[PDB]
Design a protein around this ligand. Structure first.
Ligand SMILES: *[C@H]1O[C@H](CO)[C@@H](O)[C@H](O)[C@@H]1O
Ligand SMILES: *[C@H]1O[C@H](CO)[C@@H](O)[C@H](O)[C@@H]1O
Ligand SMILES: *[C@H]1O[C@H](CO)[C@@H](O)[C@H](O)[C@@H]1O
Ligand SMILES: *[C@H]1O[C@H](CO)[C@@H](O)[C@H](O)[C@@H]1O
Ligand SMILES: *[C@H]1O[C@H](CO)[C@@H](O)[C@H](O)[C@@H]1O
Ligand SMILES: *[C@H]1O[C@H](CO)[C@@H](O)[C@H](O)[C@@H]1O
Ligand SMILES: [Ca+2]
Length: 298
Protein backbone atom coordinates (compact mmCIF):
# COMPACT_ATOMS: atom_id res chain seq x y z
CA UNK A 1 0.00 0.00 0.00
CA UNK A 2 0.93 3.66 -0.50
CA UNK A 3 0.22 6.72 1.62
CA UNK A 4 -1.11 8.58 -1.44
CA UNK A 5 -3.58 5.99 -2.72
CA UNK A 6 -6.90 7.73 -3.39
CA UNK A 7 -10.33 6.23 -2.79
CA UNK A 8 -11.23 3.77 -5.58
CA UNK A 9 -14.21 2.13 -3.87
CA UNK A 10 -17.81 3.19 -3.44
CA UNK A 11 -19.50 6.53 -2.94
CA UNK A 12 -16.41 8.37 -1.67
CA UNK A 13 -14.89 7.76 -5.11
CA UNK A 14 -17.70 9.81 -6.68
CA UNK A 15 -18.58 13.54 -6.53
CA UNK A 16 -14.97 14.64 -6.86
CA UNK A 17 -13.38 11.65 -5.15
CA UNK A 18 -11.33 11.44 -1.98
CA UNK A 19 -7.58 12.09 -1.96
CA UNK A 20 -6.98 13.20 1.65
CA UNK A 21 -3.61 14.87 2.09
CA UNK A 22 -2.24 13.96 -1.37
CA UNK A 23 -0.10 16.86 -2.52
CA UNK A 24 0.94 17.79 1.00
CA UNK A 25 3.90 16.99 3.19
CA UNK A 26 4.19 13.80 5.27
CA UNK A 27 4.75 13.66 9.03
CA UNK A 28 5.13 10.73 11.43
CA UNK A 29 3.58 11.18 14.88
CA UNK A 30 4.05 8.91 17.97
CA UNK A 31 2.44 11.02 20.76
CA UNK A 32 -1.07 12.37 21.28
CA UNK A 33 0.20 15.94 21.21
CA UNK A 34 1.93 15.40 17.88
CA UNK A 35 -1.15 13.70 16.49
CA UNK A 36 -3.72 16.31 17.41
CA UNK A 37 -1.49 19.14 16.23
CA UNK A 38 -1.08 17.47 12.84
CA UNK A 39 -4.70 16.40 12.40
CA UNK A 40 -6.17 19.74 13.51
CA UNK A 41 -3.84 21.80 11.30
CA UNK A 42 -4.88 23.62 8.15
CA UNK A 43 -3.84 22.44 4.71
CA UNK A 44 -3.01 19.20 2.97
CA UNK A 45 -1.14 16.77 5.18
CA UNK A 46 -0.30 13.07 5.31
CA UNK A 47 -0.03 11.81 8.88
CA UNK A 48 1.61 8.46 9.63
CA UNK A 49 0.84 7.12 13.11
CA UNK A 50 3.55 5.16 14.92
CA UNK A 51 3.17 3.03 18.02
CA UNK A 52 0.46 3.02 20.66
CA UNK A 53 -1.03 6.44 21.42
CA UNK A 54 -3.18 6.37 24.56
CA UNK A 55 -5.27 9.12 26.03
CA UNK A 56 -8.81 10.35 26.32
CA UNK A 57 -9.33 12.83 23.50
CA UNK A 58 -11.62 13.97 20.69
CA UNK A 59 -9.54 15.03 17.67
CA UNK A 60 -11.07 17.72 15.42
CA UNK A 61 -9.77 16.40 12.09
CA UNK A 62 -9.53 19.08 9.41
CA UNK A 63 -10.08 18.87 5.66
CA UNK A 64 -7.54 17.38 3.22
CA UNK A 65 -5.92 14.90 5.60
CA UNK A 66 -4.73 11.34 5.20
CA UNK A 67 -4.32 9.58 8.56
CA UNK A 68 -2.55 6.24 8.11
CA UNK A 69 -1.48 3.73 10.74
CA UNK A 70 1.75 1.85 10.62
CA UNK A 71 1.56 -1.85 11.37
CA UNK A 72 1.40 -2.19 15.15
CA UNK A 73 0.12 1.34 15.72
CA UNK A 74 -3.10 2.14 17.55
CA UNK A 75 -5.14 4.82 19.28
CA UNK A 76 -6.53 3.92 22.70
CA UNK A 77 -9.22 6.29 24.01
CA UNK A 78 -8.72 8.91 21.26
CA UNK A 79 -11.59 9.41 18.86
CA UNK A 80 -11.57 11.07 15.46
CA UNK A 81 -14.23 13.71 14.92
CA UNK A 82 -14.69 14.76 11.28
CA UNK A 83 -17.08 17.73 11.44
CA UNK A 84 -17.97 20.29 8.70
CA UNK A 85 -14.91 19.21 6.65
CA UNK A 86 -14.21 17.38 3.40
CA UNK A 87 -11.74 15.01 1.76
CA UNK A 88 -10.40 12.88 4.61
CA UNK A 89 -8.81 9.42 4.45
CA UNK A 90 -8.50 7.27 7.59
CA UNK A 91 -6.59 4.12 6.68
CA UNK A 92 -4.94 1.16 8.44
CA UNK A 93 -5.90 2.68 11.80
CA UNK A 94 -6.74 0.69 14.93
CA UNK A 95 -8.91 2.64 17.38
CA UNK A 96 -10.29 1.25 20.61
CA UNK A 97 -12.15 2.06 23.80
CA UNK A 98 -13.10 5.68 23.16
CA UNK A 99 -15.23 6.75 26.10
CA UNK A 100 -18.66 8.19 25.30
CA UNK A 101 -17.59 11.67 26.49
CA UNK A 102 -14.95 11.72 23.75
CA UNK A 103 -17.50 10.90 21.01
CA UNK A 104 -17.32 8.13 18.45
CA UNK A 105 -14.21 6.22 17.43
CA UNK A 106 -14.78 7.79 14.01
CA UNK A 107 -17.57 10.36 13.92
CA UNK A 108 -18.42 11.93 10.56
CA UNK A 109 -20.74 14.93 10.89
CA UNK A 110 -21.80 17.33 8.14
CA UNK A 111 -18.80 16.22 6.09
CA UNK A 112 -18.23 14.98 2.55
CA UNK A 113 -15.84 12.67 0.74
CA UNK A 114 -14.49 10.50 3.52
CA UNK A 115 -12.79 7.13 3.13
CA UNK A 116 -12.33 4.74 6.06
CA UNK A 117 -10.24 1.80 4.83
CA UNK A 118 -8.57 -1.15 6.58
CA UNK A 119 -9.41 0.13 10.03
CA UNK A 120 -9.99 -1.89 13.20
CA UNK A 121 -12.60 -0.38 15.51
CA UNK A 122 -13.78 -1.81 18.84
CA UNK A 123 -14.55 -1.32 22.51
CA UNK A 124 -15.88 -4.02 24.78
CA UNK A 125 -19.21 -5.44 26.00
CA UNK A 126 -18.21 -5.48 29.68
CA UNK A 127 -18.53 -1.80 30.68
CA UNK A 128 -22.25 -1.16 30.07
CA UNK A 129 -24.19 -0.30 26.93
CA UNK A 130 -23.60 3.47 27.01
CA UNK A 131 -20.04 3.50 28.40
CA UNK A 132 -18.91 3.81 24.78
CA UNK A 133 -20.83 5.39 21.93
CA UNK A 134 -20.34 4.59 18.22
CA UNK A 135 -17.57 3.07 16.20
CA UNK A 136 -18.36 4.73 12.88
CA UNK A 137 -21.23 7.21 12.79
CA UNK A 138 -22.25 9.30 9.75
CA UNK A 139 -24.74 12.10 10.41
CA UNK A 140 -26.01 15.64 9.82
CA UNK A 141 -26.10 15.72 6.03
CA UNK A 142 -22.75 14.03 5.39
CA UNK A 143 -22.33 12.51 1.97
CA UNK A 144 -20.03 10.38 -0.21
CA UNK A 145 -18.57 8.07 2.41
CA UNK A 146 -16.94 4.66 1.95
CA UNK A 147 -16.19 2.20 4.75
CA UNK A 148 -14.05 -0.55 3.20
CA UNK A 149 -11.97 -3.50 4.40
CA UNK A 150 -12.71 -2.58 8.01
CA UNK A 151 -13.13 -4.77 11.11
CA UNK A 152 -15.79 -3.58 13.55
CA UNK A 153 -15.99 -5.68 16.70
CA UNK A 154 -16.67 -6.17 20.39
CA UNK A 155 -19.05 -3.28 20.79
CA UNK A 156 -22.72 -2.51 21.45
CA UNK A 157 -23.83 0.25 18.99
CA UNK A 158 -21.55 0.10 15.98
CA UNK A 159 -22.52 2.36 13.06
CA UNK A 160 -25.27 5.00 12.98
CA UNK A 161 -26.19 6.71 9.69
CA UNK A 162 -28.58 9.58 10.42
CA UNK A 163 -28.98 10.63 14.04
CA UNK A 164 -32.73 11.26 14.51
CA UNK A 165 -36.09 10.83 12.80
CA UNK A 166 -36.79 14.57 12.78
CA UNK A 167 -33.87 15.54 10.54
CA UNK A 168 -35.39 15.26 7.04
CA UNK A 169 -34.48 18.75 5.79
CA UNK A 170 -30.80 18.10 6.47
CA UNK A 171 -30.59 14.35 5.76
CA UNK A 172 -33.08 13.54 2.99
CA UNK A 173 -31.29 12.86 -0.25
CA UNK A 174 -27.86 12.74 1.44
CA UNK A 175 -25.99 10.08 3.47
CA UNK A 176 -24.77 7.98 0.54
CA UNK A 177 -22.49 5.37 2.11
CA UNK A 178 -20.74 2.25 0.80
CA UNK A 179 -19.78 -0.65 3.09
CA UNK A 180 -17.38 -2.84 1.08
CA UNK A 181 -15.53 -5.95 2.26
CA UNK A 182 -16.07 -5.39 5.99
CA UNK A 183 -16.05 -7.84 8.92
CA UNK A 184 -18.44 -7.30 11.81
CA UNK A 185 -17.95 -9.48 14.93
CA UNK A 186 -19.63 -9.58 18.32
CA UNK A 187 -21.57 -6.33 17.81
CA UNK A 188 -25.01 -5.87 19.28
CA UNK A 189 -26.89 -3.30 17.18
CA UNK A 190 -26.58 -0.65 14.43
CA UNK A 191 -24.69 -2.73 11.88
CA UNK A 192 -25.48 -0.26 10.35
CA UNK A 193 -28.62 1.62 11.40
CA UNK A 194 -29.73 3.88 8.54
CA UNK A 195 -32.20 6.78 8.44
CA UNK A 196 -32.82 8.64 5.13
CA UNK A 197 -29.62 7.58 3.35
CA UNK A 198 -28.70 5.36 0.45
CA UNK A 199 -26.43 2.57 1.56
CA UNK A 200 -24.71 -0.18 -0.42
CA UNK A 201 -23.37 -3.17 1.58
CA UNK A 202 -21.42 -5.79 -0.36
CA UNK A 203 -18.92 -8.51 0.51
CA UNK A 204 -19.59 -8.05 4.23
CA UNK A 205 -19.15 -10.88 6.75
CA UNK A 206 -21.27 -10.70 9.90
CA UNK A 207 -20.51 -12.98 12.88
CA UNK A 208 -22.28 -13.18 16.22
CA UNK A 209 -24.49 -10.10 15.87
CA UNK A 210 -26.51 -9.92 19.09
CA UNK A 211 -29.70 -7.95 18.62
CA UNK A 212 -29.94 -6.50 15.12
CA UNK A 213 -27.71 -6.12 12.07
CA UNK A 214 -29.04 -3.80 9.33
CA UNK A 215 -31.87 -1.46 10.34
CA UNK A 216 -33.36 0.59 7.48
CA UNK A 217 -35.47 3.56 8.53
CA UNK A 218 -37.18 6.86 7.55
CA UNK A 219 -37.20 6.16 3.77
CA UNK A 220 -33.64 4.86 3.57
CA UNK A 221 -32.75 2.65 0.63
CA UNK A 222 -30.23 -0.09 1.45
CA UNK A 223 -28.87 -2.74 -0.89
CA UNK A 224 -27.21 -5.77 0.69
CA UNK A 225 -25.56 -8.32 -1.57
CA UNK A 226 -22.81 -10.95 -1.66
CA UNK A 227 -22.91 -10.92 2.11
CA UNK A 228 -22.89 -13.54 4.89
CA UNK A 229 -24.81 -13.55 8.20
CA UNK A 230 -23.13 -16.21 10.39
CA UNK A 231 -24.39 -17.29 13.81
CA UNK A 232 -26.34 -14.04 14.17
CA UNK A 233 -29.70 -12.74 15.33
CA UNK A 234 -32.88 -13.39 13.39
CA UNK A 235 -32.99 -9.58 12.98
CA UNK A 236 -30.66 -9.57 9.95
CA UNK A 237 -32.30 -6.79 7.96
CA UNK A 238 -35.19 -5.02 9.71
CA UNK A 239 -37.07 -1.73 9.75
CA UNK A 240 -37.81 -0.70 13.34
CA UNK A 241 -37.82 2.03 15.97
CA UNK A 242 -38.66 4.93 13.64
CA UNK A 243 -41.71 6.96 12.61
CA UNK A 244 -41.42 5.93 8.89
CA UNK A 245 -40.22 2.63 7.46
CA UNK A 246 -37.11 2.16 5.37
CA UNK A 247 -36.44 -0.27 2.54
CA UNK A 248 -33.95 -2.93 1.53
CA UNK A 249 -33.02 -4.79 -1.64
CA UNK A 250 -31.02 -8.02 -1.41
CA UNK A 251 -29.10 -10.45 -3.58
CA UNK A 252 -26.73 -13.40 -3.07
CA UNK A 253 -27.03 -13.64 0.72
CA UNK A 254 -26.00 -16.50 2.98
CA UNK A 255 -28.60 -16.04 5.75
CA UNK A 256 -27.50 -18.49 8.45
CA UNK A 257 -29.90 -17.97 11.37
CA UNK A 258 -30.83 -14.45 10.15
CA UNK A 259 -33.73 -13.12 8.09
CA UNK A 260 -34.90 -10.05 6.19
CA UNK A 261 -38.17 -8.49 7.34
CA UNK A 262 -37.68 -5.03 5.83
CA UNK A 263 -39.97 -3.84 3.02
CA UNK A 264 -38.69 -4.29 -0.49
CA UNK A 265 -36.84 -1.33 -1.92
CA UNK A 266 -35.70 -0.03 -5.28
CA UNK A 267 -31.89 0.10 -5.03
CA UNK A 268 -30.83 -2.27 -7.81
CA UNK A 269 -27.48 -3.19 -9.32
CA UNK A 270 -28.15 -0.71 -12.14
CA UNK A 271 -28.71 2.15 -9.68
CA UNK A 272 -25.16 2.20 -8.19
CA UNK A 273 -22.96 5.02 -9.60
CA UNK A 274 -19.59 3.23 -9.32
CA UNK A 275 -18.04 -0.08 -10.34
CA UNK A 276 -17.66 -2.76 -7.68
CA UNK A 277 -16.37 -6.33 -7.46
CA UNK A 278 -18.62 -8.92 -5.85
CA UNK A 279 -16.86 -11.93 -4.38
CA UNK A 280 -19.92 -14.21 -4.22
CA UNK A 281 -21.44 -15.21 -0.91
CA UNK A 282 -19.55 -18.51 -0.69
CA UNK A 283 -16.18 -16.73 -1.03
CA UNK A 284 -16.76 -13.74 1.28
CA UNK A 285 -15.48 -15.25 4.52
CA UNK A 286 -12.30 -16.50 2.82
CA UNK A 287 -11.57 -13.14 1.14
CA UNK A 288 -12.56 -10.90 4.11
CA UNK A 289 -11.62 -12.82 7.30
CA UNK A 290 -7.95 -12.00 7.85
CA UNK A 291 -7.96 -9.19 5.26
CA UNK A 292 -10.39 -6.72 6.81
CA UNK A 293 -8.77 -4.61 9.50
CA UNK A 294 -5.29 -3.24 10.01
CA UNK A 295 -3.52 -5.57 7.59
CA UNK A 296 -1.75 -3.21 5.18
CA UNK A 297 2.04 -3.12 4.62
CA UNK A 298 3.66 0.27 3.74
C1 LIG B 1 0.95 8.84 -4.41
O1 LIG B 1 1.10 10.18 -4.86
C2 LIG B 1 2.37 10.72 -4.48
C3 LIG B 1 2.42 12.20 -4.83
O2 LIG B 1 1.26 12.87 -4.32
C4 LIG B 1 3.48 9.95 -5.18
O3 LIG B 1 4.75 10.45 -4.75
C5 LIG B 1 3.39 8.46 -4.88
O4 LIG B 1 4.29 7.74 -5.73
C6 LIG B 1 1.97 7.95 -5.10
O5 LIG B 1 1.69 7.91 -6.51
C1 LIG C 1 5.10 12.53 2.29
O1 LIG C 1 5.81 11.37 2.08
C2 LIG C 1 5.01 10.32 1.69
C3 LIG C 1 5.80 9.06 1.66
O2 LIG C 1 5.82 8.55 2.96
C4 LIG C 1 4.42 10.57 0.35
O3 LIG C 1 3.55 9.53 0.00
C5 LIG C 1 3.65 11.84 0.38
O4 LIG C 1 3.24 12.19 -0.90
C6 LIG C 1 4.48 12.97 0.97
O5 LIG C 1 5.39 13.42 0.00
C1 LIG D 1 5.50 15.74 11.31
O1 LIG D 1 4.99 17.02 11.47
C2 LIG D 1 4.12 16.97 12.57
C3 LIG D 1 3.27 18.20 12.72
O2 LIG D 1 2.41 18.40 11.64
C4 LIG D 1 4.94 16.82 13.84
O3 LIG D 1 4.11 16.66 14.97
C5 LIG D 1 5.77 15.60 13.75
O4 LIG D 1 6.65 15.50 14.83
C6 LIG D 1 6.53 15.63 12.44
O5 LIG D 1 7.43 16.70 12.60
C1 LIG E 1 7.29 9.26 9.42
O1 LIG E 1 8.32 8.38 9.75
C2 LIG E 1 7.92 7.04 9.63
C3 LIG E 1 8.93 6.08 10.26
O2 LIG E 1 9.22 6.40 11.59
C4 LIG E 1 7.74 6.72 8.19
O3 LIG E 1 7.19 5.45 7.99
C5 LIG E 1 6.82 7.73 7.60
O4 LIG E 1 6.72 7.52 6.23
C6 LIG E 1 7.24 9.15 7.90
O5 LIG E 1 8.45 9.42 7.20
C1 LIG F 1 7.23 8.86 18.86
O1 LIG F 1 7.96 8.80 17.63
C2 LIG F 1 8.09 10.09 17.03
C3 LIG F 1 8.74 9.95 15.66
O2 LIG F 1 9.79 8.98 15.72
C4 LIG F 1 8.92 11.00 17.94
O3 LIG F 1 8.97 12.31 17.37
C5 LIG F 1 8.32 11.07 19.34
O4 LIG F 1 9.24 11.73 20.22
C6 LIG F 1 8.02 9.67 19.88
O5 LIG F 1 9.24 9.00 20.18
C1 LIG G 1 -3.90 18.54 19.75
O1 LIG G 1 -4.67 18.16 20.89
C2 LIG G 1 -3.86 17.58 21.91
C3 LIG G 1 -4.75 17.04 23.02
O2 LIG G 1 -3.94 16.46 24.05
C4 LIG G 1 -2.88 18.62 22.44
O3 LIG G 1 -2.02 18.01 23.41
C5 LIG G 1 -2.05 19.21 21.31
O4 LIG G 1 -1.31 20.34 21.80
C6 LIG G 1 -2.93 19.65 20.15
O5 LIG G 1 -3.67 20.82 20.52
CA1 LIG H 1 -22.41 8.66 17.93
Amino acid sequence: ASVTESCNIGYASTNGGTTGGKGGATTTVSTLAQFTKAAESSGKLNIVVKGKISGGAKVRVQSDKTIIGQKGSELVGTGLYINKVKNVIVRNMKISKVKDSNGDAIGIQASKNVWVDHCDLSSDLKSGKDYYDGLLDITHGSDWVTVSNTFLHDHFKASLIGHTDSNAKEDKGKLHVTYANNYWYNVNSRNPSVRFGTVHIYNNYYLEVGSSAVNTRMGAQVRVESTVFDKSTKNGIISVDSKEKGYATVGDISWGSSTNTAPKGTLGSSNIPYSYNLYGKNNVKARVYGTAGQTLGF
